[PDB]
C-alpha cells in the first residue's frame, strides 16, 4: 500500500466520523443560538470540546503522511487542510497565553463602552448606542468626542495586549513552516501543484495592488463627490484642497458609506424605490418571502428546497419567550439538514437578505456531494459573492415587477438608475480602499517592515495614501486604532471582502451575458434563464475541490481578479461623476496641516 | 395458505445493512397485493418482472432481503450499480429479477440522540459478490506494518455507524428496503399466484 493509497482510507474514515461530530456540534450551536439557556450553553461547549479534541487527534494522525509522495490533488488538498499544526506548534505556556490574549481581547471589545460624557451614569453601549450616534449625526463636536473617547478608552487597553498578540502570532506562524502571520492568512489564496493555474502569496499582494491601482479613478471620483456634498452640511470643517475627516464616514471606522445616503442624495426630488408599504399591503407574512425567493431560485434553474428545511429552520421571530440572536445565517449542519435562522421583518432589505442568505444555502446544497474538508468555497470570497449576486439579481426593478411587488405603470429613468448605482457604490467601492489599506498594514506589521515603535504612525500615514481621510485628533503612538475592529481584535482575515466584491461583479457580468441580456449591466437578472443557472451550478458544484483559479475560469473566462466587470457594472454612474466633477478640485493630498 | 409478506414488512426491528436479513418464503399462495397496503413507498423498481404481472407465474423460492440504508444510498440497490453499499455491504446480481421496494422510516428508525444500533461497513480488502454477507469486526490495515491485533494508528475498525436522527434530509433519513428476489431453479415450484 502506497502512501497515497493509505491516505485515502484515513481520509474516508475521518470524513465520515467528522461529519457525524460536526452535525452534533452544529445542531448544538443551532439550539444554543435559537434558545439562550444555560443547558444549551453547556451542550454547545461539550460538543465543541469533543469536536476540537477529535480535530487535534486526527491532525496528529494526519502528520504521518508527507505531502511530497502524494500525486492525487484532492487528497493533497484534504491532507494540506488536515496537516496544519495551528496554534499547537507553540509551547503549552505560549499557547495558553495566546488563548487568554484572544479571550480578553474579545471580551474587552464586546463589553467595553465609553463613560466619558458628563458623570459615569451616562454610558452608551457600542452595539445599540455608538452605532446609532455615528450613523445619524450632524455635529462635528459630538462625533469628535465619541471618536476620541472610544479609540483612546479601548486602544489604551488594546495596545500592550496587541504587541504580545502580534509577537505570539508571528512566532506560531514562523514555527508553522510559513513566513509570517500575514503569509499564513495569504495561504488561503494559494494554489500549488497545478500547471497553468498556480498562485503565490507575493502574487496575491501584487494582484491586489494592481487591481487597486486600476480601481483608483472610480474611488477618487466618488471621494470628490462625497467631499463636495459633505461641504454643504459641514461648514469650515473641511478643506477644498482635499480629504475629509475619518470620524464623519457614516460608520465609526470608515468601513461602509451606506449611512451617508441621506446627505449624499443624487436627486432629492426623486425618492429611491421602496416597496415596504407594498410588501406589507398584500399580507406577505414571513413565509411568502422565502417561498417567492425559492420560486425565483427554481426559476433560475437551481433545485427545490427539502421538506426538512421549512419545519426545522427558524424564519420567524422567536417571541418574548425563547431568547435568540436575530442575525441571519445559512446553517449547513452537515448530513442533509439545511436550516436558515433569520428573524424576518416586512421590509425590502429583509427580502434581499433572504435572497442573500439563501444563496449561501444553495452553495451548501451544491457542494454537499464533495468530501468533508472540501465543503467550502474555493476561497473565502466565493460564498458571499454567490449570495450577493443572488441579492443583486433579486434587487432589479424588473424582477420586482415580475413577482408582483411593483406596479407596471411605474417607469424607470436615468435618474433612478443613477440613484440606485450611487446607493450600491457607497456600499461596494467604499469598503475596498479600507479593506486594502487595513490588510496591507496588517501584512507589513506581521512581516516586520513596520517597526513596533512606529505602528499607528503608519495607519494615519497609509490612510493618507490609500483611503484619504484626515485624523480627527492627533493620535500618538500609545494606541492601537487598527484594533477596535471586530475583524482585528478577534483575529479575522479582512481581504475576504475585497475578493468577494471583485468576484461578485465578475460572476454577475459573466452570468447575465449568458442569459442573453442587452443593455446596462446593472439591470441584469438570472430569472427564467437556465443557461446561466447551469453555468453558475458548474462552479457551485466544485467547492474547494478544484482550485479557485480554475473555478473562476469555469464561469468567467479569466483565472485572476479583474475590476473591469466592476467598472463596467458601475459604468452608467462613473460617467455621471465625470460630468459633475468639473467645477471642484479632485483627488487628495497631504497638503493639509493642522 | 396466506403467504405472509408481513413479518418482513411489518417488523418492529429491521436489520443493519451489513448484517441484512433474508427470509426464504415458500410453500404458500403468494398474495402480492398484500404488499400494496403501505402507501408512502419511495421506490418500486421492478427489474425483470412486470409490476402488474407478478401473480401469474410460479417460482421455486422467493427471498425477501431486509435492511435499512440512507435515502441517497437507495439508488445503489440496483443491478450494475457501484458505490459504498453495492460493493461492500449488499451486492445484487446483474441478472436480477425482483423488486426494490423501499419506503421511508424516519419516524421509527431514528432518534434525536442518534440511532447507532444501525451499522454500515466502510472498509473491505475486496469488493462484495452477489448476495454475500460479511459479519466481521476484524480491524482494517491501511499501512504496511502489522497491527498486532486491536490498534489505533493506521489500523481502523471497518464498521462506521449510521447515526440516524429525525432532523436529517430526505437523502439521509433511514429507509427500510425490502428487496424481493424470485428464484427460477428447475425444481417443482412451491409459490404460485392465485387464479380461478
Ligand atoms: C427553550 O428553552 C426553554 C428554557 O427553559 C425551555 O422551555 C426549552 O429548552 C426550550 N423551549 C422551546 C419552546 O424551544
Ligand atoms: C483522486 O482520486 C479520486 C478517487 O475518488 C479520483 O476520482 C480522482 O480523479 C483522483 N484525482 C486525479 C487528479 O486523478
Ligand atoms: C418544486 O419545484 C416545482 C417547480 O418545478 C414546484 O412544484 C415547486 O416549486 C416545488 N414543489 C413543491 C411541492 O413545493
Ligand atoms: C419568469 O417567468 C414567469 C412564468 O411565466 C413569469 O410569470 C415571470 O414574469 C417571468 N419573469 C421574468 C423576469 O421574465
Ligand atoms: C402492523 O403492526 C402494527 C403494530 O402496532 C399493528 O398495529 C398493525 O395493525 C399492523 N398492520 C397489519 C396490516 O397487520
Query: What nine digits make up the cell of B9?
Result: 414488512
User: b or e along A96-111 (b: 16 or more beta carbons within 10 Å of the residue's beta carbon)?
Assistant: eebeebbeebeebbee
- CA-based nearest residue to A59, from A11, A114, A98: A11
**Cα(A266)–Cα(A170) distance, integer angstroms:** 47
Contact A360, A387 (CB under 8 A): yes
**Cα(A445)–Cα(A170) distance, integer angstroms:** 10
Task: Name the closest ligand to CA B36.
Answer: 5
Q: CA angle, corner A376, sides to A185 and B74, nearest 5?
A: 160
Q: Strands A244-245 and A469-470: what pairing?
A: parallel
Domain B1-133+159-196 -> CATH class: alpha beta
Tell me how far CA of residue A257 lies from CA of A73, A90, A251, A427, A535, in angstroms.
42, 41, 7, 6, 33
From first CA to last CA, the distance across chain A in angstroms is 72
Query: What nine digits make up the cell of B28?
Result: 404458500
Using CA atoms of A228, A233, A236, A238 in order, give the dihedral in degrees to the nearest 10: -40
DSSP state letter for A30: H
Contact A148, A263 (CB under 8 A): no
Contacts of B172 in chain A (CB under 8 A): 335-337
**Cα(A580)–Cα(B63) distance, integer angstroms:** 83
Determination technique for this entry: cryo-EM
DSSP letters spanning A274-341: --HHHHHHTT-TTHHHHHHHHHHHHHHT-----HHHHTTS--S---SSS--------EE-SSS-EE--
* Cα-Cα-Cα-Cα dihedral sign, residues A44, A46, A49, A54: negative
Hey, is B98 helix, strand or coil? strand
**Cα(A11)–Cα(A491) distance, integer angstroms:** 29
Instruction: Name the phi and psi angles at A246, rounded to 5.
Output: -75, -15
**Cα(B30)–Cα(A87) distance, integer angstroms:** 66
* Interface with B, mutate which of A308, A334, A337, A371 (most B CBs under 10 A): A308
DSSP letters spanning A386-439: HHHHHHHHHT-HHHHHHHTSS-TT----HHHHHHHHHHHHHHHTTHHHHHHHHH
Query: What nine digits make up the cell of B87?
Result: 460493493
How far B168 CA lies from chain A's nearest CA (Å)?
5
Task: Name the closest ligand to CA A525.
Answer: 4
Tell me how far CA of residue A224 lies from CA of A219, A227, A239, A241, A261, in angstroms.
9, 5, 12, 10, 15
Inspect the interface and report whether the beta carbons of B168 and A336 lie closer than 8 Å. Answer: yes
Tell me how far CA of residue A470 lies from CA of A233, A264, A339, A475, in angstroms.
18, 20, 45, 11
Which residues on neighbouring strands pair with residue A114, listed in sequence order?
A: A124
**Cα(A559)–Cα(A197) distance, integer angstroms:** 7
Radius of gyration for the alpha carbons in chain B, expressed in angstroms and rounded: 18
Using CA atoms of A217, A223, A229, A232 in order, give the dihedral in degrees to the nearest 10: -130
Ligand 4 pocket test, pick from A525, A526, A527 with the greatest ligand atom count within 8 Å of Cβ, gives A527
* Cα-Cα-Cα-Cα dihedral sign, residues A499, A500, A505, A511: positive
Name the residue of chain B whose CA is nearest to A20's CA: B163
**Cα(A331)–Cα(A341) distance, integer angstroms:** 7
**Cα(A5)–Cα(A480) distance, integer angstroms:** 50
Tell me how far CA of residue A271 lies from CA of A183, A265, A418, A419, in angstroms.
47, 9, 12, 9
**Sheet of B58-59: strands edge to edge?**
B28-29, B191-192, B58-59
Distance of CA A493 to the CA centre of its chain: 9
B39 Cα to the center of ligand 3, angstroms: 21
Nearest CA to ligand 3 atom 14: A304
Hey, is A177 helix, strand or coil? coil
Contact A27, A313 (CB under 8 A): no
Task: Name the closest ligand to CA A35.
Answer: 1
**Cα(A237)–Cα(A472) distance, integer angstroms:** 10
Inspect the interface and report whether the beta carbons of A13 and B172 lie closer than 8 Å. Answer: no
**Cα(B136)–Cα(B26) distance, integer angstroms:** 30
The 3-class secondary structure across A110-165, one letter per residue, is HHCCECCCCCCCCCECHHHHHHHHHHCCCCHHHHHHHHHHHHHHHHHHHHHHHHHH
Resolution for this PDB entry, in angstroms: 3.4
**Cα(A258)–Cα(A264) distance, integer angstroms:** 10
Distance of CA A319 to the CA centre of its chain: 29
B37 Cβ closer than 6 Å to some ligand 5 atom? yes
Contact A490, A158 (CB under 8 A): no
**Helical (H) or strand (E) element with A170:** helix A140-174
**Cα(A152)–Cα(A114) distance, integer angstroms:** 10
The 3-class secondary structure across B50-92, one letter per residue, is CCCCCCCCEECEEEEEEEEECCCCCCCCCCCCCCCCCCCCCCC
A543 Cα to the center of ligand 3, angstroms: 26
**Cα(B96)–Cα(B128) distance, integer angstroms:** 16
Burial class (CB in 10 A: 0-12, 13-18, 19+), A132: exposed
Looking at the partner chain, which of B153, B161, B169 has a beta carbon nearest the beta carbon of A306? B169
**Cα(A533)–Cα(A551) distance, integer angstroms:** 15
Contacts of A307 in chain B (CB under 8 A): 170
DSSP state letter for B138: P
Long-range contact pairs involving A78-81 (C-beta distance under 8 Å, separation at least 24): A78/A11, A78/A371, A78/A373, A78/A374, A79/A7, A79/A11, A81/A373, A81/A544
Whether A336 and chain B come into contact, CB under 8 Å, resolves to: yes
Residue given cell 423501499 in the structure block: B102
- CA-based nearest residue to B6, from B41, B34, B46: B34
Distance of CA B101 to the CA centre of its chain: 10
User: b or e along A505-541 (b: 16 or more beta carbons within 10 Å of the residue's beta carbon)?
Assistant: bbbbbbbbebbebeeebbbbbbbebeebbebbbebbb
Whether A338 and chain B come into contact, CB under 8 Å, resolves to: yes
- CA-based nearest residue to A84, from A14, A180, A173: A173
Tell me how far CA of residue A31 lies from CA of A54, A325, A333, B172, in angstroms.
22, 11, 11, 20
Residue A428: partners with Cβ closer than 8 Å, 6 or more residues away: A501, A566, A570
**Cα(B188)–Cα(B177) distance, integer angstroms:** 29
- CA-based nearest residue to B68, from B8, B6, B3: B8
Hey, is A534 helix, strand or coil? helix
Residue given cell 508527507 in the structure block: A66
**Helical (H) or strand (E) element with B177:** strand B175-183
**Cα(B155)–Cα(B148) distance, integer angstroms:** 10
Q: Is A377 left (phi over 0), alpha (psi -120 to 50) or beta?
A: beta
Tell me how far CA of residue A459 lies from CA of A150, A437, A442, A464, A476, in angstroms.
17, 8, 10, 8, 11
Domain edges within chain B: 1-133+159-196
Distance of CA A522 to the CA centre of its chain: 21
Contact A377, A189 (CB under 8 A): no
Which residues on neighbouring strands pair with residue B63, listed in sequence order?
A: B24, B181
Which residues on neighbouring strands pair with residue A452, listed in sequence order?
A: none
Looking at the partner chain, which of A9, A13, A336 has a beta carbon nearest the beta carbon of B169? A336
Q: Is B141 left (phi over 0), alpha (psi -120 to 50) or beta?
A: beta
Residue B73: partners with Cβ closer than 8 Å, 6 or more residues away: B83, B84, B85, B175
**Cα(B174)–Cα(A334) distance, integer angstroms:** 16
Distance of CA B157 to the CA centre of its chain: 22
* Interface with B, mutate which of A10, A13, A64, A331 (most B CBs under 10 A): A13
**Cα(A361)–Cα(A348) distance, integer angstroms:** 20
Burial class (CB in 10 A: 0-12, 13-18, 19+), A411: exposed
Which residues on neighbouring strands pair with residue B191, listed in sequence order?
A: B28, B59
DSSP state letter for B37: G
- CA-based nearest residue to A378, from A495, A238, A552: A552
SS3 content of chain A, % helix, strand, coil (to 5): 60, 0, 40
User: How many helices (H) does chain B have, and how many strands (E)?
Assistant: 0, 7
**Cα(A492)–Cα(A507) distance, integer angstroms:** 25
Contacts of A312 in chain B (CB under 8 A): 167
Q: Strands B175-183 and B61-69: what pairing?
A: antiparallel
Contacts of A34 in chain B (CB under 8 A): none
**Helical (H) or strand (E) element with A4:** helix A3-33
Burial class (CB in 10 A: 0-12, 13-18, 19+), A341: buried
Contact B70, B174 (CB under 8 A): yes
**Cα(A467)–Cα(A215) distance, integer angstroms:** 12
Residue B194: partners with Cβ closer than 8 Å, 6 or more residues away: B29, B30, B31, B55
- CA-based nearest residue to A274, from A415, A397, A393, A388: A397
Inspect the interface and report whether the beta carbons of B169 and A64 lie closer than 8 Å. Answer: no
DSSP state letter for A169: H
Residue A470: partners with Cβ closer than 8 Å, 6 or more residues away: A243, A244, A245, A246, A464, A592
- CA-based nearest residue to B180, from B1, B15, B27, B30: B30
* Cα-Cα-Cα-Cα dihedral sign, residues A236, A241, A245, A251: positive
The 3-class secondary structure across A192-244, one letter per residue, is CCCCCCCECHHHHHHHHHHHHHHHHHHHHHHHHHHHHHHHHHCCCCCCCCCCE
Amino acid at each position: 500500500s502506497t502512501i497515497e493509497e493509505q491516505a485515502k482510507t484515513f481520509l474516508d474514515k475521518f470524513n465520515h466520523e467528522a461529519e457525524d461530530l460536526f452535525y452534533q456540534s452544529s445542531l448544538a450551536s443551532w439550539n444554543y443560538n435559537t434558545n439562550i439557556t444555560e443547558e444549551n450553553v453547556q451542550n454547545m461547549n461539550n460538543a465543541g470540546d469533543k469536536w476540537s479534541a477529535f480535530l487535534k487527534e486526527q491532525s496528529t494522525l494526519a502528520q504521518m503522511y508527507p505531502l511530497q509522495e502524494i500525486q492525487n490533488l484532492t487528497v493533497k488538498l484534504q491532507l494540506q487542510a488536515l496537516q496544519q499544526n495551528g496554534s499547537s506548534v507553540l509551547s503549552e505556556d505560549k499557547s495558553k497565553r495566546l488563548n487568554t490574549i484572544l479571550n480578553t481581547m474579545s471580551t474587552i471589545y464586546s463589553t467595553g463602552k465609553v463613560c466619558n460624557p458628563d458623570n459615569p451614569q451616562e454610558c452608551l453601549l457600542l452595539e445599540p448606542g455608538l452605532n446609532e450616534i455615528m450613523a445619524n449625526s450632524l455635529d462635528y463636536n459630538e462625533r469628535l468626542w465619541a471618536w476620541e473617547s472610544w479609540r483612546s478608552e479601548v486602544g489604551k487597553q488594546l495596545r500592550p495586549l496587541y504587541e504580545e498578540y502580534v509577537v505570539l502570532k508571528n512566532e506560531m506562524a514562523r514555527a508553522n513552516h510559513y513566513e509570517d502571520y500575514g503569509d499564513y492568512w495569504r495561504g488561503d489564496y494559494e494554489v500549488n501543484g497545478v500547471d497553468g493555474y498556480d498562485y503565490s502569496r507575493g502574487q496575491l499582494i501584487e494582484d491586489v495592488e494592481h487591481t487597486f491601482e486600476e480601481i483608483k479613478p472610480l474611488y477618487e471620483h466618488l471621494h470628490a463627490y462625497v467631499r463636495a456634498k459633505l461641504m454643504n452640511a459641514y461648514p469650515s470643517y473641511i478643506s477644498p484642497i482635499g480629504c475629509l475627516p475619518a470620524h464623519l464616514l457614516g460608520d465609526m471606522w470608515g468601513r461602509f458609506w451606506t449611512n451617508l445616503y441621506s446627505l449624499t442624495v443624487p436627486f432629492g426630488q426623486k425618492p429611491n424605490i421602496d416597496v415596504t408599504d407594498a410588501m406589507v399591503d398584500q399580507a406577505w407574512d414571513a413565509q411568502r418571502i422565502f417561498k417567492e425567493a425559492e420560486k425565483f431560485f427554481v426559476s433560475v434553474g437551481l433545485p427545490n428546497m427539502t421538506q426538512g428545511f421549512w419545519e426545522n429552520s427558524m424564519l420567524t421571530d422567536p417571541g418574548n419567550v425563547q431568547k435568540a440572536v436575530c442575525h441571519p445565517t445559512a446553517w449547513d449542519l452537515g448530513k442533509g439538514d439545511f436550516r436558515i435562522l433569520m428573524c424576518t421583518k416586512v421590509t425590502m432589505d429583509d427580502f434581499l437578505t433572504a435572497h442573500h442568505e439563501m444563496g449561501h444555502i444553495q452553495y451548501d446544497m451544491a457542494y454537499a456531494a464533495q468530501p468533508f474538508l472540501l465543503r467550502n468555497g474555493a476561497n473565502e470570497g466565493f460564498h458571499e459573492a454567490v449570495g450577493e449576486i443572488m441579492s443583486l439579481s433579486a434587487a432589479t426593478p424588473k424582477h420586482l415587477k415580475s413577482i408582483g411587488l411593483l406596479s407596471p405603470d411605474f417607469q424607470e429613468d436615468n435618474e433612478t438608475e443613477i440613484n440606485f448605482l450611487l446607493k450600491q457604490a457607497l456600499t461596494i467601492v467604499g469598503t475596498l480602499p479600507f479593506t486594502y489599506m487595513l490588510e496591507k498594514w496588517r501584512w507589513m506589521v506581521f512581516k516586520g517592515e513596520i517597526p513596533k515603535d512606529q505602528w499607528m504612525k503608519k495607519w494615519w500615514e497609509m490612510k493618507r495614501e490609500i483611503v484619504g481621510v484626515v485624523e480627527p485628533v492627533p493620535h500618538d503612538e500609545t494606541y492601537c486604532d487598527p484594533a477596535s475592529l471586530f475583524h482585528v481584535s478577534n483575529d479575522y482575515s479582512f481581504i475576504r471582502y475585497y475578493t468577494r466584491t471583485l468576484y461578485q461583479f465578475q460572476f454577475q457580468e459573466a452570468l447575465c451575458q449568458a442569459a442573453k441580456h442587452e443593455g446596462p449591466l446593472h439591470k441584469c437578472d438570472i430569472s427564467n434563464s437556465t443557461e446561466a443557472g447551469q453555468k453558475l451550478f458548474n462552479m457551485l458544484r466544485l467547492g474547494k475541490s478544484e482550485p479557485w483559479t480554475l473555478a473562476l475560469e469555469n464561469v468567467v473566462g479569466a483565472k485572476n481578479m479583474n475590476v473591469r466587470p466592476l467598472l463596467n457594472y458601475f459604468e452608467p454612474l462613473f460617467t455621471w461623476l465625470k460630468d459633475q466633477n468639473k467645477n471642484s478640485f479632485v483627488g487628495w493630498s497631504t497638503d493639509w496641516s493642522p | 395458505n396466506l403467504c405472509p409478506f408481513h413479518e418482513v414488512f411489518n417488523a418492529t426491528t429491521f436489520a443493519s445493512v451489513y448484517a441484512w436479513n433474508r427470509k426464504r418464503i415458500s410453500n404458500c399462495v403468494a398474495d402480492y397485493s398484500v404488499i400494496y397496503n403501505f402507501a408512502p413507498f419511495f421506490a418500486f423498481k421492478c427489474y425483470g418482472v412486470s409490476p402488474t404481472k407478478l401473480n401469474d407465474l410460479c417460482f421455486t423460492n422467493v427471498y425477501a432481503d431486509s435492511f435499512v440504508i440512507r435515502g441517497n444510498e437507495v439508488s445503489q440497490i440496483a443491478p450494475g450499480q457501484t458505490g459504498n453499499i453495492a460493493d461492500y455491504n449488499y451486492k445484487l446480481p446483474d441478472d436480477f429479477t425482483g423488486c426494490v421496494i423501499a419506503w421511508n422510516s424516519n419516524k421509527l428508525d431514528s432518534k434525536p440522540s442518534g440511532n447507532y444500533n444501525y451499522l454500515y461497513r466502510l472498509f473491505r480488502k475486496s469488493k462484495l459478490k452477489p448476495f454475500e454477507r460479511d459479519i466481521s469486526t476484524e480491524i482494517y490495515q491501511a499501512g504496511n506494518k502489522p497491527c498486532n491485533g486491536v490498534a489505533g494508528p493506521n489500523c481502523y475498525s471497518p464498521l462506521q455507524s449510521y447515526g440516524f436522527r429525525p432532523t436529517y434530509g430526505v437523502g439521509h433519513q433511514p429507509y427500510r428496503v425490502v428487496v424481493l428476489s424470485f428464484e427460477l431453479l428447475h425444481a417443482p415450484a412451491t409459490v404460485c399466484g392465485p387464479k380461478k
